[PDB]
Amino acid sequence: PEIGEEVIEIKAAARDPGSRAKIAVKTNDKRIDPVGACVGMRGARVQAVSTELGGERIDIVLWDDNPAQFVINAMAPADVASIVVDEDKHTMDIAVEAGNLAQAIGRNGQNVRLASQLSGWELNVMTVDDLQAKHQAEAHAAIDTFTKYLDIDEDFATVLVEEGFSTLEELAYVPMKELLEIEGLDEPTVEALRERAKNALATIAQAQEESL
Amino acid sequence: SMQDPIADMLTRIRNGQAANKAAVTMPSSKLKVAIANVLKEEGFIEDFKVEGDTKPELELTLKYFQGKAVVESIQRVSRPGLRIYKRKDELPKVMAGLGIAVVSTSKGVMTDRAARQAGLGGEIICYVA
Amino acid sequence: ESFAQLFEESLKEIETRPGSIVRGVVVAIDKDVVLVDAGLKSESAIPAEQFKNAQGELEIQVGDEVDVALDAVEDGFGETLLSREKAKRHEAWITLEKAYEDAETVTGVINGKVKGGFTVELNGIRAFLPGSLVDVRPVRDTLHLEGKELEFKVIKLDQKRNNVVVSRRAVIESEDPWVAIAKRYPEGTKLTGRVTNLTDYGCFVEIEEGVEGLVHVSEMDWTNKNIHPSKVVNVGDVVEVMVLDIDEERRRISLGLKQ
Amino acid sequence: ELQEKLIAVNRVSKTVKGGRIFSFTALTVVGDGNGRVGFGYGKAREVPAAIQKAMEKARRNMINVALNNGTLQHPVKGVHTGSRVFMQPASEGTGIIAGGAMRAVLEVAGVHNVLAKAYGSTNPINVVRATIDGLENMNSPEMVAAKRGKSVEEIL
Amino acid sequence: TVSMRDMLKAGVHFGHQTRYWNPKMKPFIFGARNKVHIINLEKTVPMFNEALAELNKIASRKGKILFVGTKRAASEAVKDAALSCDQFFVNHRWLGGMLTNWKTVRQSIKRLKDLETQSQDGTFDKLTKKEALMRTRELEKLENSLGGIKDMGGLPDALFVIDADHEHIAIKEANNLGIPVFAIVDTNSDPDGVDFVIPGNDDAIRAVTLYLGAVAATVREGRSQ
RNA sequence: GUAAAGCGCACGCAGGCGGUUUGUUAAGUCAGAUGUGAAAUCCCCGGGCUCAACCUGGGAACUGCAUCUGAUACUGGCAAG
RNA sequence: CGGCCCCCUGGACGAAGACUGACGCUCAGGUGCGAAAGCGUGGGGAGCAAACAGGAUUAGAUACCCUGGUAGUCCACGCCGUAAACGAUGUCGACUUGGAGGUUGUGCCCUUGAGGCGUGGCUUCCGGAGCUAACGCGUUAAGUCGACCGCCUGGGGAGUAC
């Protein structure tokens, strides 16, 4: 009855009736324990819904705060470790291990859809190694793109891109004072090299003018 | 009459921590100075500053972490009424090592761990936690 | 920065304590409360009876400006002492203006001597006078058309007690309270006094230079005991009262109001 | 997952024009076998209802405790009103050496090894409160490091 | 967002007398002018801005805001502010345990709703006169008390308040439940229970209105976001 | 304070405690060493009675005392402020 | 400790300076002061009034009430050494948010007015943190500490017996 008297904050109910029914719930920090009340004495109330409309794998997740904690909670009941993000379509890239992926993924067409509506958007279950594999497939590319940005000599470019985080793709909007710590920074020229990258972006826009 | 300066120090500190006072001032003494230095080293306070020539004033700056005070507890152990002297083996452990015990030794005033490392005991001034 | 400190002293420089700087803009009217904001901590709960002029209807709408009075702060919530008292300072300035040219010229119409001296009224307020001043000579305005219009020519003022007597006719013609407390004494000199606080046994009308009167509860009316002074007269209003009794020793001048 | 122990139940009276109205107080405590602990003190005309209330209240107003593995992080004192309590961390295998209400709270807390004496009053309610106080104030090594601006190895 | 000059014009800088203050407000006080405390606007402004930002953030995640003022001078204004951003409010006396004892008050809400329905949607008239008068009176009572919070459903996710000392019951409830509190706190008030304090003149009407309007604007922004 | 428990109030010898700085001493204090602190008993690791109790080898301990050699932060003494 | 005066006399506080240079704090024994009643010797004796007497009341009334009334109360010099001698709170020192007063200094300020802004001493009430069994205490602590002393260890028997 706690939920009925506004004591168990229940937002969405991304569940698949007839199979698994995992749903997270929040609560005003006041020694309430939302999942606990939903479960009861040894799943007292949990058993009720279990054999309610039919044998369903109902699950409750202790909602933490915001959408970041909703991701992991949507991967339950399993073992999430990390996840990636983006803009409008962030696409929660589930990051778990093969051993724990067996239960995490559960069924190809079951936990991949039930946990997909959990956040309301969609999730992309991956592997710990997969993350790193794709992670590097990003460092080389702000570089892995035929270097169409600033450009000067290549021997200096290798030593600059060694220390350079996230290549130079639009990196002028970041801290323009930590590359001056690099061994070799006289007059504002590297602060100018980044400007060249900005000009390269304008050049890319000029290439768009060449194509539009 | 004033009989124990160090203890007065400690009480002042305690009261400042209780009352959320930024800084606590009091007349200076060498032993007091050294104690303050030890505390700073042990990080219970931010900084101490003596000021004056004829009658210098020690001013400690108190430390507050997430609202509450840093010096959870601070007691004298030795006192004029009843002195306490400890041998290196017998030296104490405040809060099971999490706190410290200021101890005056032949080689100066130091925390109990430091004394143990040195290999010598002495007069136990105060426990801090 | 010191922006704010400079502003604080600026705003000190551009306000004063008494009701002097006409600053409070009337920002809400409802009957029976007017309210202003003169750059004070709170808004004043103004009566409507400080702000109706001489025939009983209101005169200032929203945005209008009159200063109020100060030097008393927060009885529990709020801010002021009323603005007509401010008008008293303007009346005092007009009366003082006489000194410059030795003649203050207004209208003054004095029908009858309350306490020996005809009562003279300037536009809204009516003040009480000593005997000689109503008439320059023994002319005696009782034979003049009732409430006649001449002027006021000052004969006598008490200079700490607001008793001012003025000469209506004859345009051609042109410690401290308690030692000599025998002026309003003899048996029955009536006075115009503002009441201050009604203590459920009293009213405490007291106007005449740092004295205290009590018209307590027995007279006040022509009913004795069921009266409850707050119902029957006012708060803060100038009334009919006279002495009836003086102690110069135990400083209890026991005025009356049934007269 | 939560475990719950009713420490005590006591009959209390209210005198009225007719006679004595009796009622029952239930002192319970609940915990998850980890840091988290909470006590509840319920009252009702009948016993089961009162204990139900005690459980409800305990389930709310829960409090966390920083446990080094099975025992405490350092000796700690805690008081409440009469019941003054000392409790001391102890080596694995020793078990909960504690008396009465205190014991109960320790068990639910998920401490397995303590040496613990209740000085002063042993009024279950007050003593359990005092226990809770001693457990709450107890801080951990990481916490003190943070407080003091140091690393854990510096503090040892 | 809200400038200092505007606040000065409103009369925020003014604060209670020097016998009625709270020493926990000593930081927030600047000086004492004519035996009246002055609030330090330099320290007030940034925190007010902060509070506004937090309120906006709350709105962005679809948070429920409750606007509390029962001073009966600024009851009208707080209701207006709540409506502008279609949020909820308590402009009349706060019922003791409105939030803590929600479940009971939820029935109260439901009864009020039912009565409203009867009044309006039924169009049934033909009721015994005295009984009809009684039902009307009940409706008025319940409208006064719970009009703003009737559509609220559950518990708010944040609590804006016009006076801390006056609404301390609501504040205490919010603390017990853990709801974030956004309080205007004059010198006499106690800000310990408050999470995002706001030093300003709770009493003066124009200042109250200004506070409300900025809060409403930032709520609307967060909703738009 | 009200549960037992502040002399009715003072002065004041003995006694207890004693602001701050420098120097010195080294009594207290601390460190190391030597001598002793009987054996048995207790405790640790072992051994022997079929096991155990019991017996038994070696250690540790006996928290102390005395001396010698250092340390000098604190307490004390002495000298100057 | 209370009408005025005078004579002799102790302390307290403030204002500035100047000096001494730790000379201090506490204190078992010891010494002194110590309400009222009480005692001794000598004075005094209006009023009041233990005791006492009578009149009432009452079942009784060795009381309460009434009418009287002696010790005493008053003075001098001795003794007594106790009281709910209470703040039922030992003394000395330091530190910790506030408000409203009272009293007594004192510095500045146009005292332009009984005022304005401070800064000291003593003092009444309320109240925060903290403390407390609670009541409450709360910068005059019953808070946070130090120095020294005094005292307590179930109720009665008993602060009695020897």
From Swiss-Prot, chain D:
Alphabetic keyword roster: Acetylation, Antibiotic resistance, Ribonucleoprotein, Ribosomal protein, RNA-binding, rRNA-binding
Limits of the S5 DRBM domain: 2-65
PROSITE patterns attached to this UniProt entry: RIBOSOMAL_S5, S5_DSRBD
GO BP: cytoplasmic translation; maintenance of translational fidelity; response to antibiotic; ribosomal small subunit assembly; translation
Nucleotide-binding keyword on record: no
PANTHER family named among the record's database cross-references: MITOCHONDRIAL RIBOSOMAL PROTEIN S5
Domain notes: The N-terminal domain interacts with the head of the 30S subunit; the C-terminal domain interacts with the body and contacts protein uS4. The interaction surface between uS4 and uS5 is involved in control of translational fidelity.
NCBIfam families reported for this sequence: rpsE_bact
Functional note: With uS4 and uS12 plays an important role in translational accuracy. Many suppressors of streptomycin-dependent mutants of protein uS12 are found in this protein, some but not all of which decrease translational accuracy (ram, ribosomal ambiguity mutations).
Other observations noted: Altered uS5 proteins have been identified in a number of mutants. Some mutations in uS5 have been shown to increase translational error frequencies. Some mutants in this protein can partially suppress an alanyl-tRNA synthetase mutant.
Name of the protein this chain belongs to: Small ribosomal subunit protein uS5
